[PDB]
Design a protein around this ligand. Structure first.
Ligand SMILES: Cc1ncc(Cn2c(C)c(CCOP(=O)(O)OP(=O)(O)O)sc2=O)c(N)n1
Ligand SMILES: Cc1ncc(Cn2c(C)c(CCOP(=O)(O)OP(=O)(O)O)sc2=O)c(N)n1
Ligand SMILES: Cc1ncc(Cn2c(C)c(CCOP(=O)(O)OP(=O)(O)O)sc2=O)c(N)n1
Ligand SMILES: [Ca+2]
Ligand SMILES: [Ca+2]
Ligand SMILES: [Ca+2]
Ligand SMILES: [Ca+2]
Ligand SMILES: [Ca+2]
Ligand SMILES: [Ca+2]
Ligand SMILES: [Ca+2]
Ligand SMILES: [Ca+2]
Ligand SMILES: [Ca+2]
Ligand SMILES: [Cl-]
Ligand SMILES: [Cl-]
Ligand SMILES: [Cl-]
Ligand SMILES: [Mg+2]
Ligand SMILES: [Mg+2]
Lengths: 524, 524, 524
C-alpha cells in the first residue's frame, strides 16, 4: 500500500471522515483520489478553515482534521490556533511541504523550520524524516490532539511522500485505543469527598472543560447534592451549566479582587474544568479572602502549575465530575434559590439596545438553540438574558481572538444539524473572518448570523474610558454594509433597524432553509 | 518580605532543603544569606551538578533543586538533561541572569533567549517578566517538575530580582498540594481486568517508571496473580522487579524483531511504566507477531502517542499498579519457574572477565546494595549476574548519555545513606564527569566506584564489527591512570589486576569510611 | 558516489582536513572509511572536543569541523558553544542521528527536535529531509559558519544517510567561493575618513574581531596616523594590538560609568571589531559624556543593533581596517607616549603573587608565545604584565564560560606548532574541562598549563565582598592535587611553591618535548 492509502485508512479507523481545508499545490498529492467516504469542507481563508473545524470539534466532542497550504496557509490560521489552544480543541492541523528534493534549495512554498512555525500554540509539532514514517506521525498527531488536555497539533508532510510505499507494519496503528479517562485514586478521592461533605458553605466554579466533557449533568447533580451556588469561571469559552437552574449564579467578573470578594464566606470552593483563573482586567487585591480554601480539578498540568492559590488535581473532567456527583452526601442545607429574571431595558422605536436583542432571541429561539458570542461589549448581558438549558449551547473566543464566532458557528451548525445555531457578532468582529459566510452558503449550513452594528469597537472605547486614555486612534469602523457582504457571499440578508423589524427578521430567519445574516442597528 | 525570603520559604514549604550547584556571579544574590536549614552540595562542573541531583531525585523519589551559572553553566549541563528527560527525573533547574538593566545591551553573562536554551529537554522553561513574579514562577517550576510525567524544568532569574519586595499574596503558593495520582475509571478498569483475567498466556513488561513510583511490590503481586513472566523493557534506566523472583525473565533486547519473537505466543502483553519500546539497534521486522495484543500503561502522553502498536492508558503508575494488583483474579496456572543461575566464566590469574567482576560483586556486596551501570559493553551480563531484591537498586543513563553514573552514584548515595552504592563504569565513560569524584571526597559520600579498564570504547568497537566498518578513528583510550585521577580529587584508590586483588580491594572498599575507587584491569 | 564520499570530497575541497570528535554509534557510519588525508583528534568529553576545535579555529583563522555523539554529545558541548558564539568562532558542529526508520519511535539515541537543541547558540541549525540533501546541507553549514559574522552552526545527520547514493549534481558544491569581504562604499567611507581627520582628540577601541581578521597591523598604522590612544574593549576574548606599542592603553574596565569617564574629552571614538560594549559589572551612569561621538565598525548586525549609542557600520573588519589605515591623513599631533612598566609587587620566599607569576612568564617565555587566560581574579594584572607583540597572542572565554582555556590551549597549540602556548588557569576553572589534558598527551601537543592554585573561586569571593553578601556557600575548592590529575592523563607534572621553584619549573617546561602542567601555589 501507499503512504496515501495507509494514511486515509488510519484516519477512517480513528473516526475521522471530514477534512476542513483550503488547498495548495503541496497538498494536491494528499487530496488526489480523495476517498468517497470522506467529506471536504472548503473555506476561502485559513482563519475560516480552522475556525470552522474548531466549532465542529468543540460541538462534536471529537477531533477535527485540517489541511492547510504550507507556511502561508498555516500562518494565516495562527490567530485561530490561539483560540484553539485556550479551548483545548482537538485539532489535527496538517500542511503540505515541498518535495524532499527541493527543500534544501528553499524552492517557493518550502515551509522553513516547519515544526517551529505554529509554536507555542500547539501540543506537538512535527515533520517526518521519511515517507514511510508519515502514517506513524499521523497516528501521533491524532493521539496527541485527543489525549487530555486536548489541543491542536501540527504535522508537515513533503508532497512526494504520499505516493511512496508504506511500511506494512503500519497496520498496527489503525485500531490503537488510547485513554486518558482517569480520576483521582480512591484514598485521595475519599479525602476530597469528605472535605466537600464537611464544608459549611461550599461554592462551585465551572469552566469550559466541563462542557467539553459533557460533564454538565453530573455537575448539576453535584451542585444539588452539595446545595451549592454555581458560577462560571471568567472569560468563559463555553457554558457548563443550565443558566436557569436554581444554583446558577452567572459569569464571574474577570478580576482578582472581584472574584475573592464574590467567594468571601465560602469555606470550600471547588473549581472544575477551568484555569484558576482567566482574569482579564487589572483588578489587584487578594486571590482569596481569609477563610476560603480552593480546590481545583483540571485536565491540564499547565493550569494546575500556574494557579496562584489552592490545591489541584489533574485528571479527566468527565471521570471526576461523575465520581464526585455520585459519591458526595445529600446536604440537608436548603437548595439555593434561582436568580431573578433580568430587568427589561426601556426600548423606544429606534436603534436596539443589546439587552432587547438578547431578550428577543431568548423569546423566539428554540430551547435547544446554540449561541456564539463575538459581541465583546455585551457579554455580561448576553449571559444574563439567554436561558441555555442544554450542554453545548454557548461558544466565545477562548483566547479573546476575534474572527472565531463567524466560522465557528458554521462548524457548530455542521456538527449539530438539528440545533439552530445563532451567532451574535459585533460589526467590528464580523470582518475578521467575513469570507467564512461563503462556506455556509455553498454547503447550505443554515447558521443565523446576527450582526450587532453600532459602528465602533465598543469594548475598546469603554476600556479607553477606564484608562482615561485620550486621543486613541482606530476605534471606529463606519461605512460597512453587512447586507451587501452577505449578498457577496451568497447568504440571504435582512436588516433590523428597530424592534418591529428585529422580530420580523428573526421570524423569517428561523424558518429559512439556508444561512441568514441579520444586520441589527444597535445603540452606540 | 523580599523575593529571596519568599522564594526560600516556598521551597522549604514544598519540601526542598538541598541545592545542587556550581555558583556564578548572577547567582550570588540568590545564594547570599543562604538559609541555615538548607544544604548546598557543590560540584566542579555542571554535568556533575546535574548528574548528582538526578541520582538524588531518582533515588529519593522527590524533586531535586539545582542552581547553575547562567548560560554557560546551563549549557554544560545539557547532556545531563538529556538523560533526565528520558528518566522522567523531577529536576528544578534554576540559573541566574544578568541584572534587568543590563540585559538589553547583552553584557557579559547575559543568557540570551534564556528559555529557549534548554529546549527540547525540559517540560517547561521560563524567565519571569518582573521580580515579584519570581516566587510564582518558582511555584510553577516545582509543580511542572513534579506532576506526571515528571521531568526537568528551567527557570532563569535576573540577579536584581532577589532583593525586591515580594507580593504578600505569594503566601498562597506555600502550601499548594498538586496531585496527578490518578487511575483509569472503574468501568474501563473493569474491562482491562477482565482482559487480563481471560488471557491464556499473559506476559508483563516493566519500565523505569515502575521503580520511580515504588510500584515494584505491586507488580510482583500482579505477576504472581497472573502467573505471568516479567521482562524489563529495553534500554532500562532502572530495575522495576526483583531479579531472582521466579517470574523474572530479564532485560529485553532493544530490537523490533527480537522483541516480537520473545513475545510470540503471549496473547496479552501488559506493559507498565515504559515507552513502547526504547529500541536501539536496527533489527527490522514485525512489531508484534499475529496473536499478540499489547496494552500499555504509561505516565506520559508522549509515550502513548508514539507507540507503533497496542492500546494505551495514560495514568499514574503507582495508582494503576496498585489497583491492578488488587483487582485481578488468582490464576490457577502454574507459577513460572525461576531462571537458572548464570554460568561461571573460566577465569585465569590474569585480567578480569566482566562476568567475574559481576559475580564477585554479587557475592560480596550487601543484599541492599545499589548499582549504577556505565559499562556499556557489559550490560547484558550485569543484568544476569546481580541479584537485586529491592527497589531502587539499579540506574543506567536513560538517554544513553555517558557521564551520568559517576555523579549520579554520589547523589544516590546521598539519598540512601544506609545502602552501599557501587558504580560500575567503563574506562571511557569514567572521564566524562570525572571531576564529580571531588564532591564525594569533600562531603564524604561513601560511594564505591569500580572502573572497568580495558583501554577501549568497547561497545563502539563491537558495533564497528557488526557494521563491517573499517578504519574508524577514535575508539581507543589508552594511557589513563584512574588511581592518580582519584588521588587528584581526594578519593582513596585501589587497583585490581586479577581476581585475588579484586576480592582484596572490594573487602577494603566495603569497610572504608569514605568513597573508594577501584581500577579493575579487564579483558579487551 | 555515496553521500559519504561526496561529503568528504566537499570538505576537502573547502579546505577542511581535521575532525575534532568524540564518537558514538550514530556517527560510526560517518567515520568509517575515514579518509587517509584527514586527521581525527579525539577528546574525552564534548566540552573538550569543542574547546579544542574552537582554539584551533580562532588561531588558524578558518573553520573547524566537529563531530559529536547525538543529543547527549551535543548537549555536553553547549557551554563551549556559548563561548564560541561570543567569539564569532567558525565551528561546523555535526552530530549523528538515529536511522530514519527508527526516529519516529524515538529509539535510544534519537535526537528529538534536533535543530532546536543548540539554539540560541548557533547561526544556523538543521537536519536534512533526505540522504541526498546531506552534501548540500553540509555546504550550507560550511558557508554559514564562515561568512561574517562568523559563528557556530549545527547539522544533524541520520546515520543511514551516508551509504545512500548522492546526487551527481552535488559536484557544483565543491568549489563554491563565498565572500563577505566587504567595506563601506566610497562616498560614505570618505565621510568617515574626513570625520577622523577632523577630530581634535580621537581615541580607538579594538575588539576581538580585529585579531580574528589579522587586522592588528592595519590598526597599528591607523593609530599611528591618527596619533590616537588605543584601548581594548572590555571582557576581551582576544588581543588586537601590540601591548607595548606607544599608543596602547590597556583593557577597558567593563562598566558603563567607567568607560564614559575614560573616554571623556575624546571627541571621536572609533570602535572596531567589538560589541559596544561587553560590560559586566553594574556600574550605572552615562554611556558617553557630552562632547564624545562614537562610531562603531562591526562585522555583526546584532552588535550594531544593540549598541546603546553611536553610529555603526556593518562590514568585514579586515577590509575596513585596511581601507581606513591607508586613507586617513598623517596627523601632526604628537604620538602618544608608551604606558610605564608595571610595578614589581613585593614577593617573599612563600606563596606566589599572581603579579610575580605574570612577570616571570613575561621574562622567560618566547616573544612569540601565545597565552590563554582562565584565571578570573587576575585578568587586569595579566594584561598589564605580558608584552604581546604579535597577533593571535591571547584568548579568554568570550562568554565568560569556564572550561574554555584548557582545551582551547591544546587547539591553539595544534594550530601554531612553532609558537609556545601557555595557559594560565585558576584551580577552580581547571576542573571544568580537566580531561582535555589527555588529548595533549596522546597527540603530544606541547601546551604548557600553569595552574594558579589559591584554593578558592577568587573572583566570586571578591564579588561577594562588593555585594556585602554574607553566608554564600560553594566558594572554596580545597583538596585538589593537580599534579596527580596531570599524571592521571599522562602529562608531565611539576609544582612551584615559591619563586625559585617557579623559575625552575618554567625552565624545565619550556625545554620539554611534550605538554607540561605546573601547579603554582598562589596567595589567597
Ligand atoms: C484578532 C484580534 N484583533 C483585535 C482584537 C482587539 N479587540 C477589538 C478590536 C474589539 C472590538 C470588537 O468590536 P465589535 O464591534 O465586534 O464589538 P463591540 O462593539 O461590542 O465591542 S474587542 C478586542 O479585544 C482582538 N481581540 N483580536
Ligand atoms: C556523551 C556521550 N558521548 C559519547 C557517547 C558514545 N558512546 C561511547 C563513547 C561508548 C564507549 C564507552 O566506553 P566504556 O569504556 O565506558 O565502556 P565499554 O568499553 O564497556 O564500551 S558507548 C556510547 O554510546 C555517548 N553515549 N555519550
Ligand atoms: C561554566 C561556568 N561555571 C561557573 C562559572 C562562574 N565563575 C566561577 C566559578 C569563577 C571562579 C573561578 O575560579 P578560579 O580558581 O579558576 O580563578 P580565580 O580564583 O582567580 O577567580 S569566575 C566565574 O564566573 C562560569 N563563569 N562558568
Ligand atoms: Ca424605565
Ligand atoms: Ca422574555
Ligand atoms: Ca461594535
Ligand atoms: Ca570452561
Ligand atoms: Ca555467586
Ligand atoms: Ca572500555
Ligand atoms: Ca614594597
Ligand atoms: Ca621583567
Ligand atoms: Ca582560584
Ligand atoms: Cl484506586
Ligand atoms: Cl470511576
Ligand atoms: Cl563604492
Ligand atoms: Mg512560531
Ligand atoms: Mg536549545
Amino acid at each position: 500500500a501507499s503512504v496515501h492509502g495507509t494514511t486515509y485508512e488510519l484516519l477512517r479507523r480513528q473516526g475521522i471522515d471530514t477534512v476542513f481545508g483550503n488547498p495548495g499545490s503541496n497538498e494536491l498529492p494528499f487530496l488526489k483520489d480523495f476517498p468517497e467516504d470522506f467529506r471536504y469542507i472548503l473555506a476561502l481563508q485559513e482563519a475560516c478553515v480552522v475556525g470552522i473545524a474548531d466549532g465542529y470539534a468543540q460541538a462534536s466532542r471529537k477531533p477535527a482534521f485540517i489541511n492547510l497550504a504550507s507556511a502561508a496557509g498555516t500562518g494565516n490560521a495562527m490567530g485561530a490556533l490561539s483560540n484553539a489552544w485556550n479551548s483545548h480543541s482537538p485539532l489535527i492541523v496538517t500542511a503540505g511541504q515541498q518535495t524532499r528534493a527541493m527543500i534544501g534549495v528553499e524552492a517557493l512554498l518550502t515551509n522553513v523550520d516547519a515544526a517551529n512555525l505554529p509554536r507555542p500554540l500547539v501540543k506537538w509539532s512535527y515533520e517526518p524524516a521519511s515517507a514511510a514514517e508519515v502514517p506513524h506521525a499521523m497516528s501521533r498527531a491524532i493521539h496527541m490532539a485527543s489525549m487530555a488536555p486536548q489541543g491542536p497539533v501540527y504535522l508537515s508532510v513533503p508532497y512526494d511522500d504520499w505516493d511512496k510505499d508504506a511500511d506494512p507494519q503500519s497496520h498496527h496503528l489503525f485500531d490503537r485505543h488510547v485513554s486518558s479517562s482517569v480520576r483521582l485514586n480512591d484514598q485521595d478521592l475519599d479525602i476530597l469527598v469528605k472535605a466537600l461533605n464537611s464544608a459549611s458553605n461550599p461554592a462551585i466554579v465551572l469552566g469550559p472543560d466541563v462542557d467539553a466533557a459533557n460533564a454538565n449533568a453530573d455537575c448539576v447533580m453535584l451542585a444539588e447534592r452539595l446545595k451549592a451556588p454555581v458560577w462560571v469561571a471568567p472569560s468563559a469559552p463555553r457554558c457548563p451549566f443550565p443558566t436557569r437552574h436554581p444554583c446558577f449564579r452567572g459569569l464571574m467578573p474577570a478580576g482578582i479582587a472581584a472574584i475573592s470578594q464574590l467567594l468571601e464566606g465560602h469555606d470550600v470552593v471547588l473549581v472544575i474544568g477551568a484555569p484558576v483563573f482567566r482574569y482579564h482586567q487589572y483588578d489587584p487585591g487578594q486571590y482569596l479572602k481569609p477563610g476560603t480554601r480552593l480546590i481545583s480539578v483540571t485536565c491540564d498540568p499547565l493550569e494546575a502549575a500556574r494557579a496562584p492559590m489552592g490545591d489541584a488535581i489533574v485528571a479527566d473532567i468527565g471521570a471526576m465530575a461523575s465520581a464526585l456527583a455520585n459519591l458526595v452526601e445529600e446536604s440537608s442545607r436548603q437548595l439555593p434559590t434561582a436568580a431573578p429574571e433580568p430587568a427589561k431595558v426601556d426600548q423606544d422605536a429606534g436603534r436596539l439596545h443589546p439587552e432587547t436583542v438578547f431578550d428577543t432571541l431568548n423569546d423566539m429561539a428554540p430551547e435547544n438553540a446554540i449561541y456564539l458570542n463575538e459581541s465583546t461589549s455585551t457579554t455580561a448581558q448576553m449571559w444574563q438574558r439567554l436561558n441555555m438549558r442544554n450542554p453545548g449551547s454557548y461558544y466565545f473566543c477562548a483566547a479573546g481572538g476575534l474572527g472565531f464566532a463567524l466560522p465557528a458557528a458554521i462548524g457548530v451548525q455542521l456538527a449539530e444539524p438539528e440545533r439552530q445555531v445563532i451567532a451574535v457578532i459585533g460589526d467590528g468582529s464580523a470582518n475578521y473572518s467575513i469570507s467564512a459566510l461563503w462556506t455556509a452558503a455553498q454547503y447550505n449550513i443554515p447558521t443565523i448570523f446576527v450582526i450587532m452594528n453600532n459602528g465602533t469597537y465598543g469594548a475598546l472605547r469603554w476600556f479607553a474610558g477606564v484608562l482615561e486614555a485620550e486621543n486613541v486612534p482606530g476605534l471606529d469602523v463606519p461605512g460597512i454594509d453587512f447586507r451587501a457582504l452577505a449578498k457577496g457571499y451568497g447568504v440571504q440578508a435582512l436588516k433590523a433597524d428597530n424592534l418591529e423589524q428585529l422580530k420580523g427578521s428573526l421570524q423569517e430567519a428561523l424558518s429559512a432553509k439556508g444561512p441568514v445574516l441579520i444586520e441589527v442597528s444597535t445603540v452606540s
